[PDB]
């Protein structure tokens, strides 16, 4: 399929993709920006720590109302959170990409996340009931995710 | 209710019998254009006329 | 060794001070589990059902002040789990808590 940012050469690279994933787009975008450029083992450890609330993802663009935490100081930031669902979805996508690297025969102890992108998926319609006989939307905001890992050591 | 007339019962029976999904072999027919039964009625959402 | 077993007494009163009425026994169980984790260093702590009963003996808000428990660190060598060892905490009925030490017990 068509990824944006095709790799420099697709011999030492592997790809992973997911569509219409039911995670919040804003949380996933922040998590992906956190893990972008990491070595794969470091990124896996980081995502597990995010699930354990030992390391946080910094909320840099979608930070309206996001609280402060001590662990955002690792980044040059003040506002951070621990998106468990985003961390789990990205961990699953990382494992899929590592299996793709195994299939391509390129060693996984040198993989580095060179590209990761979170797009908005089509929204899903639900309903909420308001005060004076009114109906309001209760949309879900799912996301497509794509990632390209590359050997570099 | 438990007390119902024969006409009411027969009307409910017809509305029951036509509230079923399309057969799967229908979509394999030539020039079908039908995907799913759009006349499905759930007892809690849409109430019958009677 | 790591199949050790010891008898402790827990100051439930000290760990439960300040908690609202409807959360005192649940918080006492959370505090017992946290105590076992701090003592034996194993994340997997199994509260005995008799110990749970002892904690809930006087209702939800009038938790006993002191509870004598026994921590038995055992092997989890029965399945594939991240935790190699688990601590099972049981209830030790006592008549008084005066002069009660932490004691190593035998199998």
């Amino acid at each position: 399929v068509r990824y944006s940012l095709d790799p420099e050469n697709p011999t030492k690279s592997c790809k992973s993709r997911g569509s219409n994933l039911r995670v919040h787009f804003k949380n996933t975008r922040e998590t992906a920006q956190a893990i972008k450029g990491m070595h794969i083992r470091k990124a896996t450890k980081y995502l597990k720590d995010v699930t354990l609330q030992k390391q946080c993802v910094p909320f840099r663009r979608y930070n309206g109302g996001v609280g402060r935490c001590a662990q955002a100081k690792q980044w040059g930031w003040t506002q951070g959170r621990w998106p468990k669902k985003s961390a789990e979805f990205l961990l699953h996508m990382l494992k899929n990409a590592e299996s793709n690297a195994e299939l391509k025969g390129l060693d996984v102890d040198s993989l580095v996340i060179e590209h990761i992108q979170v797009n908005k998926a089509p929204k899903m319609r639900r309903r909420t009931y308001r005060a004076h006989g009114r109906i309001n939307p209760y949309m879900s905001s799912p996301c497509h995710i794509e990632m390209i890992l590359t050997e570099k050591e | 209710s438990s007390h119902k007339t024969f006409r009411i019962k027969r009307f409910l029976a017809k509305k029951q019998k036509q509230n079923r999904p399309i057969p799967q072999w229908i979509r394999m027919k030539t020039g079908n254009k039908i995907r799913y039964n759009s006349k499905r009625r759930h007892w809690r959402r849409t109430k019958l006329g009677l | 060794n790591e199949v050790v077993t010891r008898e402790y007494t827990i100051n439930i009163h000290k760990r439960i001070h300040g908690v609202g009425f409807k959360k005192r026994a649940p918080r006492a169980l959370k505090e017992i589990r946290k105590f076992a984790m701090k003592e034996m260093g194993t994340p997997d702590v199994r509260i005995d059902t008799r110990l749970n009963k002892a904690v809930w003996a006087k209702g939800i808000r009038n938790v006993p002040y002191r509870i004598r428990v026994r921590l038995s660190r055992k092997r989890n060598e029965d399945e594939d789990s991240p935790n190699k060892l688990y601590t099972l905490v049981t209830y030790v009925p006592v008549t008084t808590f005066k002069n009660l030490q932490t004691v190593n017990v035998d199998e």
């Binding site: - | 024969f6 019962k9 027969r10 409910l12 029976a13 017809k14 029951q16 019998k17 | -």
Partner: protein, 60 residues
């Protein structure tokens, strides 16, 4: 147990079963199903075995 015409009464069902299966029946109970088909429970006379009759009919 039979599925019968919704317009047939108990006497008609009894006589029809008797004629087209060569059996004697004791009583007929009748209900109309929620799907609109009439169902008849036809009890057979003591000297007729409903198991053997169902075997001859072929519905075992």
């Amino acid at each position: 147990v039979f599925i019968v015409d919704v317009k047939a009464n108990k006497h008609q069902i009894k006589q029809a079963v008797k004629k087209l299966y060569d059996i004697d029946v004791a009583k007929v109970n009748t209900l109309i199903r929620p799907d609109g088909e009439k169902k008849a429970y036809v009890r057979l006379a003591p000297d007729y075995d409903a198991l053997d009759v169902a075997n001859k009919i072929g519905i075992i």
